[PDB]
Structures are given as C-alpha cells and as structure tokens.
Amino acid sequence: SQITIQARLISFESNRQQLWKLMADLNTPLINELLCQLGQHPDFEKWQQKGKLPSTVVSQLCQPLKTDPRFAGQPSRLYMSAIHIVDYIYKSWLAIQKRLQQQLDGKTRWLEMLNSDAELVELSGDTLEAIRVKAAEILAIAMSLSKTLFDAYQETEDIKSRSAISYLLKNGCKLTDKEEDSEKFAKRRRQVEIQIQRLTEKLISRMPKGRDLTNAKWLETLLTATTTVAEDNAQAKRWQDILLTRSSSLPFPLVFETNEDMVWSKNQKGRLCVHFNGLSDLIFEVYCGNRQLHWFQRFLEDQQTKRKSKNQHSSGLFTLRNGHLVWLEGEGKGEPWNLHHLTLYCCVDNRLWTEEGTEIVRQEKADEITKFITNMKSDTQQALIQRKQSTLTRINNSFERPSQPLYQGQSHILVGVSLGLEKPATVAVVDAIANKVLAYRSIKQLLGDNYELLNRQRRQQQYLSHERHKAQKNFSPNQFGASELGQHIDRLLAKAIVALARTYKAGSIVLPKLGDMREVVQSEIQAIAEQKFPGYIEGQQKYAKQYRVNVHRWSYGRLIQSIQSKAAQTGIVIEEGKQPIRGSPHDKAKELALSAYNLRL
DNA sequence: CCGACGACAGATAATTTGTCACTGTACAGTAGAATATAGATGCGCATCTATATAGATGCAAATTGAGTGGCCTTATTAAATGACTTCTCAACCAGTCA
C-alpha cells in the first residue's frame, strides 16, 4: 500500500553546508559499524546459519562509538540513522545468504534423487513396472503432495523402494507409462548439475561494503604502486583491483523512522517549511509541483490537528510514515553542498488519505497492538506498554479527513494477466461462475495511443547498446540506456490493467508465479550448448546470446510490482497461479485466472 | 529321034475388101452389201508401293536446391548498461529551559 513522494529542500548555504559536514562525518561510522561485524564480530557464522541479525547487536556496537573522538559531534537522531541503515544492510544480506543456502541443499537432495529408468532397475533389483506399481501404491497412501513425497524420500528409504518415490517426483507427482530417452535424461540431469555448480559459486558473496568518500586507500595505493616493486603477481594485481575502483561521491542518506521527528510549519511568504529532530536551527523550504503539494499540506494539517487537540490524537495515523533525506547528484563544478541537491523522500501510506481508508489502518493497528500487549504480558518493558496503551487509546480519536466509499468488486470476476518475452502483458477478464471471458486485451489495445512506445523501447535498447560498446572502446563517459522508458511502459500497462479491472468490477487481478526465470533459462541453454560445442567454452557462451540477454533484460518483476502498487492504491485484491506452458497469450491469461479462482478452497 | 526340065507369056480361082439385105437381142428399178473375225488404241477404275511423317518414349548430362559433416583459449579484478533477490519504513514518556 505505501508510496514515496518527494520534494527538493532549499536553504541558504550556511544550512546546506552544515548539514553536508554532519553527513560526511556520519557517513564514516556507517563504514566503521560495518567493519565491526564484517571481520571483528566472532558470532558471525551463527547469524549466517540462522539467516537473521540479533535485533540489538548494531546498537551495542554503536553505543561506545558515540563517544569516539571521530564520531562524537553528531545529534542523537543521526546515530539512530546510522544504526537503522547498518541494521537494514545486514538484515537484508543475511536473508539473501540463507535462501541461497536453502536452494543449494533443496537441489543437492534432487541431484541424488534424479535417476535414469535403468538406474532405478539396478538400484531396486526389480522391473520398471514393479516401480510403476509401487509408485501407484505411494500415490494411494498420499491420497502438500510434492513436499510429502520429498519427505517420504527423506524419511522411509524402505529397502531402496524410495526409488519409486523419485519415479513419481521426476514425473511431476504422477504415473507415467513411457520409458525415457537417455539423451533427454542426460540433458535434464546436466541442468541440475549446472544449477548445483552455480549455487555453490553464488553461495560465497562479497561482504557488504561501505561508501568510502575519503579516497585515502586509493591515494595510499597510488603512491605505493608507482614508487615500490610488488613481490608477487597477486600483490601487483591487488594494487590494480584497488586502483581501478571508482570511489563514491555521496554520503548515505539520513533515515528518520519516526514521523514526528520532522516538524512542519508555514513560512511568512506562505511556502511550507520543515526542520528535523536535532537540527532544529536549520529551517528548510519545500519546493514541489502542485501534482504532489496536497500531501505536503496534509503533513502540516495532521501536525496542527494533533497540537490543537492536546496530543489526544496519535501519529499512529499520521499520513507521513518516515523520511529519507538524500543528496541527489548535481552537474558541473562547485562545493558539494552547492553542487548536489537536498531531496526529502516521504514514505506515505496512501490508504490514510481518506477517512474510509484511515479506518482500515485503525483496525489493522488496533488488532496488532492488542496482540503485542498480550504476547508481552520488566521495568522499561512497562514503559513500552505505556507507549502502546497510549496508542491503543488515542488511535480511536479521528482526524477530520476526505470521504470516499471503498471500491467493491464481484468475487467471481477476475482479471488474468499473462507476461512473456514478445508480449510484456496480455489480459483476459473472466466471469468464473459463467466460465465466460467478458473481454480480452492485447498490447495494441492495453496501452492504446502509446503503442509506439514498445517499438521505441526495442529500438532504444538495440541502438543504445551498440553506442555503449562504441563509447567504451574510446573511454567516453557517455553511457545511456532505455531503463526509464521501460519503467514508464511498465507503469502505463499497470494503470490500464487496473482501469480495466475497475471497468468490469473485478474482485481481483491475477499475476503469474513466474519465479526465477533468468536462472532457469541460463541453466537450460548451458546444458544444451555443452552438447553442440563440447570443450569449446567460448562457443558454449556464444550459443544463444540474444535469447539469454533478452531474458536478463525481461522486466517481469518491475511490471508485477507496478501492477501490485496501482491495484492496492485502488483496493483490488492480488491473487496468483501457475502460468500455462502452451496456448496463445490469451489462452495463458484465461487459464491463469480460472486456475487462481479454482485455488480459492 | 525321044524324053525331061527351064523361060516367058497367058488364063484362072483363092483371098481380101466392099456393099447389101435379113436378123437375134437388149431397153425394160437394182450388186454394192451383209456378216463374221483379228488387231491396235484409248478411257476408266482398282490395287498396290514408297515417302513422310509428328507424337510418344527412353536416356543421358546439367545443373539446382536441399541437405549433412568437420573444425574451434581461458581464469581472476575493475568500471559501464540492463535486470533479479533480501531488509527496513514505532509513537509518548521522562528530563531541562526561558
């Protein structure tokens, strides 16, 4: 449901320079608090096993750095911004590492389980029919299915008769009469080996890096490498890998996770202003287009409404949720605080705009807070329960807000969206009780006046990829791509799909479980290419470049998110299902929506 | 002296020619014409022949499009572009101050 809106902040130099000095000084303990985990912390491998960072460890590394002679000059809210960012860095990276570990194991199982029909006969000492009969018994026992069969191979080895359980699993949890081609099986088993290899490589990841602004390592390395002689090829390359590294120009943003830690006001000139907790001397002026101003007026109205009411209304329902203050990169020459541009990005929960939507968040938080208090039931823990119960009481007192009746769709009408390489979207609206398609749309309809933009995107990707190649050979800085055009097209389709869902009173939009299509294609094309260029690895990589590149450029996750966002701002439910391997783009969309309807029970 | 033969002259019927009177006989519608044959020549109709085939067939290059087979450098770092995944996104109470 959340959105991010933005404004540039304007102030006189003294204020934009003082804030830069604090952020160039704050950017450094964001580096030192990474290193205090990256190599200093002894428990680190226990966290990599569990997949989660302990909720207090970054604060317990930061608390003694608050008096460090290098870091002591900063407000209490700038240290909380440091702790926030470093918590979110590790809390992300450990959660990436854990899903990779789980995938590697979850296929190391399957590379053991996957056997040819002849190997099952040898391993069982029995007929492939005896295996078909035992596979029929195992389905009769089971009737969670695929997991239950995996568990019944992980348990219940059963005098190697788990051979028949692998026979079900390789057949997609079904009986098969046909006996398989050993060349097709060799390609299949090789794809798993490739996925296993690729996972054992990706299992090791570069320990998350800090944004060093100082150039000190680079300058020290330059004067070392030019005046001294390396003792090894490894040392001479270690200096090369440092000297090639581009250094950052921007400090990490400030994060203000409490909405009240931004204070709003109106300037004499009638313009809006803002100030931050601990920087309450530095008034900043808001500059934003009238297409976004209504939120910045709402910020000040939410604040005035609470202050006019003796704090009896809660910022648990303030339209602003959190702010990220960032320096966007400028152009040309000048001091960093005169060259770059302070920009304030406000997280906003869009459903807090209206009274009917605010009531949803009131019920959502009142249920979550009630459960929290009953799960809790020590000294400061009682003070925390005072924060919570003052919220649980205050959240019932309403802000005066715009009214708009909630959208309601028919529980039987669904929009199916089918994504692919040639057709980025294609739509079928199904009445699932009639089994009747109400409408279909192809791309030429689904973004209408804008259909020239798909042809533009394909021209621009091809044109600009060649210009980047020509530019790199000359060391030109000019490096451009179609990324913002692809982002616009994915947003045009997201608006049109939801406008169509509203038009037909659909209860939900259905999006495919595409999963990691990029890795799957990379393994399939490799297992095939190894049969056509054996030993010539450069020829294996050249086999289907344009197909592999087009799959790595395929924006399916960004279109899926663009539709999710616009649907949840409108109130339409999102649902999911398996996308058919065969059929036209329409048939894919039709069967996808009907499948998601069948999954209701 | 007697008998036989030739010269010359003289007389004479046969022969030829002419004249004269009496008479048998053709004139009377009448033989070119009829009736066979061989032998050569010419016009007509049939009965072969020798030339003249164009259509059909067999075959043998002459490409012609469509296949198939054989031969190939690779591993790190850094930057750029295009993508994917994960994480995060409290709110009021307690201690100073003009």
Residue of A523, A518, A522 whose CA lies nearest to A187:
A523
**Is A265 strand, coil or helix?**
strand
Protein CB footprint (7 Å) on chain B nucleotides: 72-94
| Closest alpha carbon to C1' of B87, residue | A92
Which residues contact residue A490 at a Cβ distance below 8 angstroms, ignoring those fewer than 6 apart?
Answer: A424, A555, A558, A559, A562
| CB A39, CB A307: distance < 8 Å | no
Provide the CB-side half-sphere exposure for A82 (13 A, CA): 31
Distance CA A563, CA A494 (A): 5
User: Which nucleotide in the DNA or RNA is closest to residue A461, CA to C1'?
Assistant: B82
How far in angstroms lies nucleotide B38's C1' from the CA of residue A89? 155
Asked if A215 CB < 7 A from strand B, the reply is no
A299's tokens: 């910020």
**Is A348 strand, coil or helix?**
strand
Helices A452-473/A483-503 angle, 10° precision: 160
3-state helix, strand, coil in chain A (%, to 5): 55, 10, 30
How far in angstroms lies nucleotide B9's C1' from the CA of residue A404? 234
Asked if A481 CB < 7 A from strand B, the reply is yes
How far in angstroms lies nucleotide B13's C1' from the CA of residue A464? 198
A581's tokens: 């391997």
Which residues contact residue A58 at a Cβ distance below 8 angstroms, ignoring those fewer than 6 apart?
Answer: A33, A37, A83, A86, A87, A90
Distance CA A235, CA A221 (A): 11
Residues 406-445 of A with CB under 7 A from strand B: none
Q: Is A479 left (phi over 0), alpha (psi -120 to 50) or beta?
A: beta
User: Which nucleotide in the DNA or RNA is closest to residue A247, CA to C1'?
Assistant: B79
User: Which nucleotide in the DNA or RNA is closest to residue A93, CA to C1'?
Assistant: B86
Asked if A480 CB < 7 A from strand B, the reply is yes
Distance CA A125, CA A194 (A): 30
Asked if A314 CB < 7 A from strand B, the reply is yes
Neighbours of A463 (CB within 10 A): 12
Residue of A492, A505, A495, A490 whose CA lies nearest to A557:
A490
* β-pair type (A427-431, A436-441): antiparallel
Residues 529-568 of A with CB under 7 A from strand B: 533, 535-539, 552-558
Query: Can you give the resolution of this entry in Å?
Result: 3.0
Asked if A257 CB < 7 A from strand B, the reply is yes
Using alpha carbons, list the distances in angstroms from residue A375 to A169, A365, A372, A380, A384: 42, 15, 5, 16, 13
Using alpha carbons, list the distances in angstroms from residue A152 to A116, A128, A130, A165, A241: 20, 20, 18, 7, 50
Query: What is the layout of strands, in order, in the sheet containing A320-328?
Result: A254-256, A320-328, A341-349, A2-10, A284-287, A272-276, A262-266
Asked if A322 CB < 7 A from strand B, the reply is yes
How far in angstroms lies nucleotide B28's C1' from the CA of residue A240? 187
Neighbours of A118 (CB within 10 A): 13
Residue of A71, A65, A56 whose CA lies nearest to A36:
A65
